[model samples]
Target: AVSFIGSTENDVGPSLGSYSRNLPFVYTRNKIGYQNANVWHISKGFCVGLDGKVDLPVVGSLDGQSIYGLTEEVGLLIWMGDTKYSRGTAMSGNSWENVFSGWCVGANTASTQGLSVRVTPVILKRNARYSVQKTSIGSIRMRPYNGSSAGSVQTTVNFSLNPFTLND
Candidate 1:
């Protein structure tokens, strides 16, 4: 988790031309939200929360780039060694329905085969502030989705604030 003052802009983004190439990124321009596909990318170390949203770090962005719609490549990589989301068993492409499913835990994809990165403010707004702790945290951790198996990877974070009304 991260505490932001205003917004995030392209602080981090997918490789250039991810949408034109039809590649799954952690962000997208199309109306579709983050891909609903579900698999934990072992490389990054982030997991898709059961709420169909991946916990992204929040902070002030360069040009509001961090606040764009969600994509699949921004968070940790979780794969099942099988073709669950993408051509590779461990990969899945981001789509409109997939992102929606991620929000609702839709069944179009599996639980531990895709990276379900959530589309957040990248930088949270004052309305989302909870405390007067004007400052924020430094490091944020992304996790992977390990299945029912014991060795499945998991993610955790300790950011300064979350999305909420300032009065909350």
Candidate 2:
């Protein structure tokens, strides 16, 4: 099992509730892409799925699993509004070169306290084009979303010896 202890920009941590800090738990993996692994992956958005069964398919059970040096395919979700959700993913055998990419904007007002910029849930394993020693995640670009300013925010992720995904 892979364990990660990290902090996000503005000291936003994760909590399982409508009211919480940052939503992402970032990590670096060796290989990624659910379909590439011959497995279909259906991403999940923020919800109240207390029960193990949800109303969606393509949802592979990552619970109680280790995710280090292993395949890095992953999905992501963002809160658009009070009751609506938006999502993006990078797990379809996709490859992105050196660049900052994720930028999500919402209809929230300029005075919005949050929802300015978002983060990628997981950084996919870099393709073989790059050297193996350079495994650091690509730097995130400063995105001006929802009338928010454009500037880079620093967040750190600490990977434990046995990082793990949540399980019910």
Candidate 3:
């Protein structure tokens, strides 16, 4: 059976315009039976916008984006964003409590200036023949002011459950 394991964090972005980063988590599995050792769970995953306050006057708008999902051989998409995912307030100076949540993905565009933040859970199978890794689970994105040619700055703080592995 699966259980609540530890977690991991990674930082990405601070680029210009609409940008996305693929944050993959790597792991290994024991060569036991599939039910006994191959399957694992990834829960309580999320991201945080780390861009601080900026002193740019608005001409359009700025926003941030994030999504959570799993991948093995191919891509499996999950938890794409909606209105909540298009985070604009956090682009400037704001609190996380107002901007982020679990199992989220979103987008927005305007022209002004900043960045945004995800949490989700997933399950996967592993093989002892090769090293296993989860992809796109921690991927993040940021949409700066649409009209501003100067562009807005952005960054990210990510968290997710630890991958399954044998003590090697």
Candidate 4:
């Protein structure tokens, strides 16, 4: 069995929800498209953080009668608005990176069964609203021992960064 939890933290946009209705827009008139287009323009920069946690059973053995081992791995994917940013890339003039690749292994009964990760100090543009999505993927595996076969389980969970704006 596996479960996931995730959240986002904003350090500069505490009053983000107030500016949602009056966001600025940039108009492009038939220059790149056949019809006119109005796009949201984000200006000022702010800091945001992403965090996730995974909980799973610490499976030592599939048969429950031998000295077995287990391994857990977790990863996170983030999307700002509609663009998927790569690791160590520049976003709105600030460098951003993923710090959420977590791995663990154990052979005990009830010692460690949780994996947590975070990516902090993310700089994002303000003055406009954005739809941010974060996805968490996790996997747990029972190691093969002696003559026993291997077994594995996986899970995925998604979270939305609400308030949607940094216009404070």
C-alpha lDDT of all candidate models, in order = 0.24, 0.21, 0.24, 0.21
Candidate 2 per-residue lDDT, tens place, 51-168, comes to 0111111222234322223234433221111111122222211122112233332333121111111222332333222111212122111223333332232222211112223211
Residues 120-155, model 3: lDDT tens digits: 212233332322242223323322222222122223
lDDT of 3 at 116: 29
For model 2, what is the alpha-carbon lDDT of residue 129? 22
lDDT of 1: 0.24
Q: Per-residue lDDT of 57-76 in model 4, one digit per residue for the tens? A: 22222122111111122111
- The TM-score, computed over Cα atoms with residue i paired to residue i, of candidate 2 is 0.21
- Give residue 83's lDDT in candidate 4 (0 to 100): 17
Measured against the true structure, the TM-scores of the candidates, in listed sequence, are 0.20, 0.21, 0.22, 0.24
**Top-lDDT candidate index:** 1
**What's model 3's lDDT at 42?**
20
In terms of TM-score, which candidate is strongest?
Answer: 4
Model 3, C-alpha of 5: deviation from truth (Å): 30
Worst 10 residues of 2 by lDDT: 46-55
Candidate 3 wrongly placed segments (more than 4 Å): 1-77, 80-136, 149-152, 155-168
**Evaluation by lDDT, superior candidate among 1 and 4:** 1
